[PDB]
Symmetry: none
Subunit: 135 residues, 3 copies
Protein backbone atom coordinates (compact mmCIF):
# COMPACT_ATOMS: atom_id res chain seq x y z
CA UNK A 1 0.00 0.00 0.00
CA UNK A 2 2.76 2.65 0.77
CA UNK A 3 5.99 2.91 -1.29
CA UNK A 4 5.71 -0.16 -3.58
CA UNK A 5 8.36 0.12 -6.34
CA UNK A 6 9.90 -1.78 -9.21
CA UNK A 7 13.25 -0.06 -9.97
CA UNK A 8 15.30 -1.26 -12.95
CA UNK A 9 18.76 -0.24 -11.59
CA UNK A 10 19.20 2.06 -8.58
CA UNK A 11 17.42 3.81 -5.69
CA UNK A 12 18.99 6.59 -3.53
CA UNK A 13 18.04 9.59 -1.36
CA UNK A 14 21.20 11.53 -2.45
CA UNK A 15 23.04 10.22 -5.55
CA UNK A 16 26.28 11.36 -7.20
CA UNK A 17 26.97 9.64 -10.55
CA UNK A 18 30.28 10.93 -12.03
CA UNK A 19 31.56 8.97 -15.03
CA UNK A 20 32.91 8.42 -18.59
CA UNK A 21 35.89 10.79 -19.25
CA UNK A 22 34.93 13.49 -16.67
CA UNK A 23 36.83 16.05 -14.60
CA UNK A 24 35.06 16.69 -11.26
CA UNK A 25 37.38 19.22 -9.67
CA UNK A 26 37.27 21.85 -6.82
CA UNK A 27 33.57 21.31 -5.64
CA UNK A 28 31.89 22.24 -2.32
CA UNK A 29 28.93 19.97 -1.50
CA UNK A 30 27.03 20.96 1.71
CA UNK A 31 23.86 19.11 2.67
CA UNK A 32 21.66 19.84 5.71
CA UNK A 33 19.00 17.13 5.34
CA UNK A 34 15.95 16.65 7.58
CA UNK A 35 13.95 13.63 6.37
CA UNK A 36 11.95 12.08 9.24
CA UNK A 37 9.16 9.63 8.28
CA UNK A 38 6.19 9.11 10.64
CA UNK A 39 3.91 6.17 9.78
CA UNK A 40 0.52 5.59 11.51
CA UNK A 41 -0.59 2.80 9.15
CA UNK A 42 -3.33 0.15 9.38
CA UNK A 43 -4.29 1.33 12.89
CA UNK A 44 -7.60 -0.48 13.44
CA UNK A 45 -10.28 0.03 16.08
CA UNK A 46 -12.86 -2.74 15.32
CA UNK A 47 -16.04 -3.56 17.31
CA UNK A 48 -17.78 -6.50 15.57
CA UNK A 49 -20.80 -8.71 16.32
CA UNK A 50 -21.06 -11.72 13.96
CA UNK A 51 -23.98 -14.08 14.55
CA UNK A 52 -25.76 -16.60 12.33
CA UNK A 53 -28.58 -16.66 14.96
CA UNK A 54 -28.51 -13.95 17.66
CA UNK A 55 -31.74 -14.63 19.63
CA UNK A 56 -34.36 -17.41 19.51
CA UNK A 57 -37.27 -17.30 22.05
CA UNK A 58 -40.15 -19.87 22.09
CA UNK A 59 -41.14 -22.74 19.69
CA UNK A 60 -39.39 -21.19 16.63
CA UNK A 61 -37.95 -23.49 13.86
CA UNK A 62 -34.69 -22.51 12.11
CA UNK A 63 -33.13 -24.60 9.32
CA UNK A 64 -30.41 -24.06 6.60
CA UNK A 65 -29.56 -20.51 7.85
CA UNK A 66 -26.27 -20.28 5.87
CA UNK A 67 -25.23 -22.78 3.14
CA UNK A 68 -21.94 -22.41 1.19
CA UNK A 69 -21.97 -25.26 -1.35
CA UNK A 70 -21.56 -27.46 -3.21
CA UNK A 71 -18.23 -25.87 -4.30
CA UNK A 72 -16.19 -27.38 -7.18
CA UNK A 73 -12.93 -25.50 -7.89
CA UNK A 74 -9.98 -26.25 -10.19
CA UNK A 75 -6.96 -24.01 -10.87
CA UNK A 76 -3.82 -24.42 -13.10
CA UNK A 77 -5.37 -27.35 -15.01
CA UNK A 78 -3.94 -26.74 -18.53
CA UNK A 79 -3.05 -29.48 -21.07
CA UNK A 80 -0.09 -29.61 -23.56
CA UNK A 81 -0.63 -32.73 -25.81
CA UNK A 82 2.22 -33.55 -28.26
CA UNK A 83 1.90 -36.20 -31.03
CA UNK A 84 4.85 -36.24 -33.52
CA UNK A 85 6.15 -38.78 -36.05
CA UNK A 86 9.79 -37.55 -36.33
CA UNK A 87 11.60 -34.69 -34.54
CA UNK A 88 14.98 -33.27 -35.41
CA UNK A 89 16.16 -30.48 -33.10
CA UNK A 90 19.54 -28.83 -33.62
CA UNK A 91 20.33 -26.24 -30.94
CA UNK A 92 23.55 -24.24 -30.86
CA UNK A 93 23.50 -21.87 -27.85
CA UNK A 94 26.31 -19.46 -26.86
CA UNK A 95 26.06 -16.98 -23.93
CA UNK A 96 22.22 -17.47 -23.77
CA UNK A 97 19.52 -17.34 -21.07
CA UNK A 98 17.19 -20.07 -22.48
CA UNK A 99 14.10 -21.92 -21.23
CA UNK A 100 12.53 -24.75 -23.37
CA UNK A 101 9.10 -26.32 -22.55
CA UNK A 102 9.57 -25.38 -18.85
CA UNK A 103 6.57 -25.03 -16.49
CA UNK A 104 6.95 -22.23 -13.85
CA UNK A 105 4.05 -22.04 -11.35
CA UNK A 106 3.47 -19.98 -8.20
CA UNK A 107 0.24 -20.48 -6.23
CA UNK A 108 -0.29 -18.41 -3.07
CA UNK A 109 -3.59 -18.99 -1.23
CA UNK A 110 -4.17 -17.10 2.05
CA UNK A 111 -7.67 -17.04 3.67
CA UNK A 112 -9.50 -19.66 1.61
CA UNK A 113 -12.36 -21.41 3.43
CA UNK A 114 -12.97 -19.27 6.49
CA UNK A 115 -16.09 -18.47 8.50
CA UNK A 116 -14.59 -15.23 9.98
CA UNK A 117 -11.23 -13.35 9.77
CA UNK A 118 -10.14 -10.35 11.89
CA UNK A 119 -7.02 -8.31 11.20
CA UNK A 120 -4.34 -8.11 8.54
CA UNK A 121 -3.71 -10.53 5.65
CA UNK A 122 -0.71 -10.02 3.31
CA UNK A 123 0.77 -11.77 0.18
CA UNK A 124 4.03 -10.57 -1.49
CA UNK A 125 5.54 -12.31 -4.55
CA UNK A 126 8.96 -11.19 -5.91
CA UNK A 127 9.91 -13.24 -8.97
CA UNK A 128 13.22 -14.81 -10.12
CA UNK A 129 16.42 -12.92 -10.93
CA UNK A 130 18.26 -14.53 -13.89
CA UNK A 131 21.11 -13.28 -16.13
CA UNK A 132 24.00 -14.27 -18.42
CA UNK A 133 27.19 -12.17 -18.68
CA UNK A 134 29.96 -12.85 -21.26
CA UNK A 135 33.28 -11.01 -21.87
CA UNK B 1 2.48 -3.28 3.16
CA UNK B 2 5.18 -0.47 3.49
CA UNK B 3 8.45 -0.25 1.49
CA UNK B 4 8.10 -3.29 -0.82
CA UNK B 5 10.82 -3.06 -3.50
CA UNK B 6 12.25 -4.91 -6.44
CA UNK B 7 15.60 -3.24 -7.27
CA UNK B 8 17.59 -4.49 -10.27
CA UNK B 9 21.09 -3.52 -8.95
CA UNK B 10 21.62 -1.23 -5.93
CA UNK B 11 19.91 0.54 -3.02
CA UNK B 12 21.43 3.42 -0.97
CA UNK B 13 20.57 6.41 1.21
CA UNK B 14 23.73 8.31 0.07
CA UNK B 15 25.52 6.94 -3.02
CA UNK B 16 28.75 8.06 -4.70
CA UNK B 17 29.42 6.32 -8.03
CA UNK B 18 32.72 7.58 -9.54
CA UNK B 19 33.99 5.62 -12.56
CA UNK B 20 35.34 5.01 -16.11
CA UNK B 21 38.29 7.41 -16.77
CA UNK B 22 37.22 10.00 -14.16
CA UNK B 23 39.23 12.57 -12.21
CA UNK B 24 37.62 13.33 -8.83
CA UNK B 25 39.94 15.91 -7.28
CA UNK B 26 39.88 18.48 -4.38
CA UNK B 27 36.22 17.93 -3.20
CA UNK B 28 34.55 18.83 0.12
CA UNK B 29 31.52 16.63 0.90
CA UNK B 30 29.69 17.71 4.13
CA UNK B 31 26.48 15.91 5.15
CA UNK B 32 24.30 16.70 8.19
CA UNK B 33 21.63 13.97 7.85
CA UNK B 34 18.60 13.52 10.12
CA UNK B 35 16.56 10.49 8.95
CA UNK B 36 14.49 9.03 11.81
CA UNK B 37 11.73 6.54 10.87
CA UNK B 38 8.80 6.10 13.29
CA UNK B 39 6.50 3.13 12.55
CA UNK B 40 3.14 2.62 14.31
CA UNK B 41 1.96 -0.15 11.98
CA UNK B 42 -0.76 -2.83 12.03
CA UNK B 43 -1.81 -1.63 15.49
CA UNK B 44 -5.07 -3.39 16.28
CA UNK B 45 -7.72 -2.94 18.94
CA UNK B 46 -10.33 -5.64 18.14
CA UNK B 47 -13.47 -6.46 20.16
CA UNK B 48 -15.26 -9.42 18.52
CA UNK B 49 -18.33 -11.55 19.31
CA UNK B 50 -18.62 -14.59 16.99
CA UNK B 51 -21.53 -16.97 17.58
CA UNK B 52 -23.35 -19.52 15.47
CA UNK B 53 -26.15 -19.32 18.10
CA UNK B 54 -25.90 -16.62 20.80
CA UNK B 55 -29.20 -17.29 22.67
CA UNK B 56 -31.85 -20.05 22.58
CA UNK B 57 -34.74 -19.88 25.13
CA UNK B 58 -37.62 -22.42 25.26
CA UNK B 59 -38.72 -25.30 22.95
CA UNK B 60 -36.94 -23.96 19.80
CA UNK B 61 -35.54 -26.23 17.01
CA UNK B 62 -32.29 -25.21 15.27
CA UNK B 63 -30.78 -27.38 12.48
CA UNK B 64 -28.04 -26.86 9.79
CA UNK B 65 -27.17 -23.30 11.01
CA UNK B 66 -23.93 -23.14 8.96
CA UNK B 67 -22.94 -25.66 6.27
CA UNK B 68 -19.73 -25.33 4.24
CA UNK B 69 -19.52 -28.01 1.50
CA UNK B 70 -19.30 -30.44 -0.09
CA UNK B 71 -16.02 -28.85 -1.26
CA UNK B 72 -13.95 -30.36 -4.10
CA UNK B 73 -10.72 -28.45 -4.79
CA UNK B 74 -7.79 -29.25 -7.11
CA UNK B 75 -4.71 -27.17 -7.83
CA UNK B 76 -1.65 -27.52 -10.14
CA UNK B 77 -3.21 -30.40 -12.04
CA UNK B 78 -1.86 -29.89 -15.59
CA UNK B 79 -1.00 -32.63 -18.14
CA UNK B 80 1.94 -32.82 -20.63
CA UNK B 81 1.38 -35.96 -22.85
CA UNK B 82 4.16 -36.85 -25.35
CA UNK B 83 3.82 -39.52 -28.09
CA UNK B 84 6.77 -39.65 -30.54
CA UNK B 85 8.17 -42.22 -32.99
CA UNK B 86 11.71 -40.78 -33.41
CA UNK B 87 13.61 -37.96 -31.66
CA UNK B 88 16.99 -36.52 -32.55
CA UNK B 89 18.28 -33.75 -30.30
CA UNK B 90 21.69 -32.18 -30.87
CA UNK B 91 22.45 -29.57 -28.21
CA UNK B 92 25.70 -27.60 -28.11
CA UNK B 93 25.62 -25.22 -25.15
CA UNK B 94 28.40 -22.75 -24.21
CA UNK B 95 28.16 -20.30 -21.24
CA UNK B 96 24.33 -20.80 -21.12
CA UNK B 97 21.75 -20.65 -18.35
CA UNK B 98 19.51 -23.40 -19.76
CA UNK B 99 16.36 -25.18 -18.52
CA UNK B 100 14.67 -28.01 -20.55
CA UNK B 101 11.26 -29.58 -19.66
CA UNK B 102 11.70 -28.56 -15.99
CA UNK B 103 8.72 -28.20 -13.60
CA UNK B 104 9.16 -25.40 -11.00
CA UNK B 105 6.28 -25.21 -8.47
CA UNK B 106 5.67 -23.10 -5.35
CA UNK B 107 2.47 -23.61 -3.36
CA UNK B 108 2.01 -21.51 -0.20
CA UNK B 109 -1.25 -22.08 1.73
CA UNK B 110 -1.80 -20.14 4.97
CA UNK B 111 -5.29 -20.07 6.64
CA UNK B 112 -7.04 -22.63 4.52
CA UNK B 113 -10.00 -24.33 6.30
CA UNK B 114 -10.73 -22.32 9.48
CA UNK B 115 -13.74 -21.32 11.54
CA UNK B 116 -12.13 -18.15 13.01
CA UNK B 117 -8.79 -16.28 12.71
CA UNK B 118 -7.59 -13.26 14.74
CA UNK B 119 -4.49 -11.20 13.95
CA UNK B 120 -1.79 -11.11 11.33
CA UNK B 121 -1.19 -13.51 8.42
CA UNK B 122 1.81 -12.97 6.10
CA UNK B 123 3.14 -14.86 3.00
CA UNK B 124 6.38 -13.68 1.30
CA UNK B 125 7.86 -15.48 -1.74
CA UNK B 126 11.27 -14.40 -3.12
CA UNK B 127 12.20 -16.54 -6.11
CA UNK B 128 15.50 -18.03 -7.33
CA UNK B 129 18.66 -16.15 -8.19
CA UNK B 130 20.54 -17.76 -11.12
CA UNK B 131 23.39 -16.67 -13.41
CA UNK B 132 26.20 -17.63 -15.77
CA UNK B 133 29.38 -15.55 -16.03
CA UNK B 134 32.17 -16.19 -18.63
CA UNK B 135 35.52 -14.38 -19.18
CA UNK C 1 5.08 -6.24 5.99
CA UNK C 2 7.76 -3.46 6.26
CA UNK C 3 10.98 -3.34 4.17
CA UNK C 4 10.48 -6.40 1.88
CA UNK C 5 13.28 -6.26 -0.71
CA UNK C 6 14.63 -8.10 -3.70
CA UNK C 7 17.97 -6.42 -4.54
CA UNK C 8 19.90 -7.72 -7.53
CA UNK C 9 23.44 -6.77 -6.33
CA UNK C 10 24.04 -4.52 -3.25
CA UNK C 11 22.30 -2.71 -0.38
CA UNK C 12 23.94 0.03 1.73
CA UNK C 13 23.13 3.17 3.76
CA UNK C 14 26.22 5.14 2.63
CA UNK C 15 27.98 3.70 -0.43
CA UNK C 16 31.19 4.78 -2.16
CA UNK C 17 31.83 3.02 -5.49
CA UNK C 18 35.15 4.19 -7.08
CA UNK C 19 36.41 2.12 -10.07
CA UNK C 20 37.69 1.61 -13.68
CA UNK C 21 40.72 3.94 -14.26
CA UNK C 22 39.64 6.63 -11.78
CA UNK C 23 41.66 9.15 -9.76
CA UNK C 24 40.10 9.94 -6.35
CA UNK C 25 42.45 12.51 -4.82
CA UNK C 26 42.34 15.08 -1.94
CA UNK C 27 38.62 14.66 -0.86
CA UNK C 28 37.10 15.68 2.49
CA UNK C 29 34.16 13.40 3.37
CA UNK C 30 32.30 14.47 6.57
CA UNK C 31 29.12 12.71 7.67
CA UNK C 32 26.98 13.46 10.75
CA UNK C 33 24.24 10.81 10.40
CA UNK C 34 21.21 10.41 12.70
CA UNK C 35 19.20 7.35 11.55
CA UNK C 36 17.07 5.94 14.41
CA UNK C 37 14.30 3.46 13.51
CA UNK C 38 11.40 3.03 15.99
CA UNK C 39 9.09 0.04 15.33
CA UNK C 40 5.70 -0.37 17.07
CA UNK C 41 4.51 -3.12 14.73
CA UNK C 42 1.73 -5.72 14.96
CA UNK C 43 0.71 -4.44 18.43
CA UNK C 44 -2.53 -6.35 19.04
CA UNK C 45 -5.15 -5.87 21.74
CA UNK C 46 -7.79 -8.58 20.99
CA UNK C 47 -10.92 -9.28 23.10
CA UNK C 48 -12.72 -12.20 21.41
CA UNK C 49 -15.75 -14.37 22.29
CA UNK C 50 -16.12 -17.44 20.00
CA UNK C 51 -19.01 -19.86 20.69
CA UNK C 52 -20.96 -22.35 18.59
CA UNK C 53 -23.72 -22.07 21.25
CA UNK C 54 -23.38 -19.33 23.93
CA UNK C 55 -26.68 -19.91 25.84
CA UNK C 56 -29.36 -22.65 25.79
CA UNK C 57 -32.30 -22.48 28.28
CA UNK C 58 -35.19 -25.01 28.43
CA UNK C 59 -36.21 -27.91 26.10
CA UNK C 60 -34.40 -26.48 23.02
CA UNK C 61 -33.08 -28.82 20.26
CA UNK C 62 -29.83 -27.92 18.45
CA UNK C 63 -28.37 -30.12 15.69
CA UNK C 64 -25.73 -29.60 12.89
CA UNK C 65 -24.75 -26.07 14.12
CA UNK C 66 -21.50 -25.94 12.07
CA UNK C 67 -20.50 -28.48 9.36
CA UNK C 68 -17.28 -28.17 7.31
CA UNK C 69 -17.48 -31.05 4.80
CA UNK C 70 -17.10 -33.35 3.09
CA UNK C 71 -13.83 -31.80 1.84
CA UNK C 72 -11.72 -33.31 -0.96
CA UNK C 73 -8.48 -31.43 -1.73
CA UNK C 74 -5.55 -32.36 -4.01
CA UNK C 75 -2.55 -30.20 -4.90
CA UNK C 76 0.50 -30.63 -7.24
CA UNK C 77 -1.13 -33.54 -9.09
CA UNK C 78 0.21 -32.90 -12.62
CA UNK C 79 1.05 -35.72 -15.11
CA UNK C 80 3.94 -35.97 -17.68
CA UNK C 81 3.28 -39.14 -19.83
CA UNK C 82 6.10 -40.01 -22.32
CA UNK C 83 5.87 -42.66 -25.10
CA UNK C 84 8.85 -42.70 -27.52
CA UNK C 85 10.01 -45.42 -29.95
CA UNK C 86 13.62 -44.14 -30.47
CA UNK C 87 15.60 -41.30 -28.77
CA UNK C 88 18.94 -39.78 -29.70
CA UNK C 89 20.28 -37.04 -27.45
CA UNK C 90 23.69 -35.53 -28.05
CA UNK C 91 24.46 -32.89 -25.41
CA UNK C 92 27.73 -30.94 -25.32
CA UNK C 93 27.74 -28.53 -22.34
CA UNK C 94 30.55 -26.07 -21.49
CA UNK C 95 30.29 -23.63 -18.54
CA UNK C 96 26.47 -24.05 -18.45
CA UNK C 97 23.96 -23.95 -15.58
CA UNK C 98 21.73 -26.74 -16.94
CA UNK C 99 18.55 -28.46 -15.70
CA UNK C 100 16.75 -31.24 -17.72
CA UNK C 101 13.35 -32.87 -16.81
CA UNK C 102 13.87 -31.80 -13.15
CA UNK C 103 10.90 -31.40 -10.75
CA UNK C 104 11.35 -28.60 -8.15
CA UNK C 105 8.45 -28.41 -5.67
CA UNK C 106 8.00 -26.23 -2.55
CA UNK C 107 4.79 -26.71 -0.51
CA UNK C 108 4.29 -24.60 2.64
CA UNK C 109 1.07 -25.18 4.66
CA UNK C 110 0.55 -23.29 7.97
CA UNK C 111 -2.97 -23.15 9.56
CA UNK C 112 -4.91 -25.65 7.40
CA UNK C 113 -7.69 -27.30 9.47
CA UNK C 114 -8.30 -25.31 12.67
CA UNK C 115 -11.35 -24.23 14.64
CA UNK C 116 -9.75 -21.00 15.98
CA UNK C 117 -6.36 -19.22 15.64
CA UNK C 118 -5.09 -16.20 17.64
CA UNK C 119 -1.96 -14.19 16.81
CA UNK C 120 0.68 -14.11 14.09
CA UNK C 121 1.18 -16.56 11.20
CA UNK C 122 4.23 -16.08 8.89
CA UNK C 123 5.52 -17.94 5.76
CA UNK C 124 8.75 -16.77 4.08
CA UNK C 125 10.15 -18.62 1.05
CA UNK C 126 13.58 -17.60 -0.32
CA UNK C 127 14.48 -19.85 -3.27
CA UNK C 128 17.79 -21.33 -4.52
CA UNK C 129 20.93 -19.41 -5.46
CA UNK C 130 22.83 -21.09 -8.37
CA UNK C 131 25.63 -19.98 -10.70
CA UNK C 132 28.44 -21.00 -13.06
CA UNK C 133 31.58 -18.84 -13.35
CA UNK C 134 34.31 -19.57 -15.99
CA UNK C 135 37.73 -17.92 -16.62
Amino acid sequence: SIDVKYIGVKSAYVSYDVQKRTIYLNITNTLNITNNNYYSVEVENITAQVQFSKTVIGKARLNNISIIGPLDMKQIDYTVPTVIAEEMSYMYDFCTLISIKVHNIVLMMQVTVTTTYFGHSEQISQERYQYVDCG
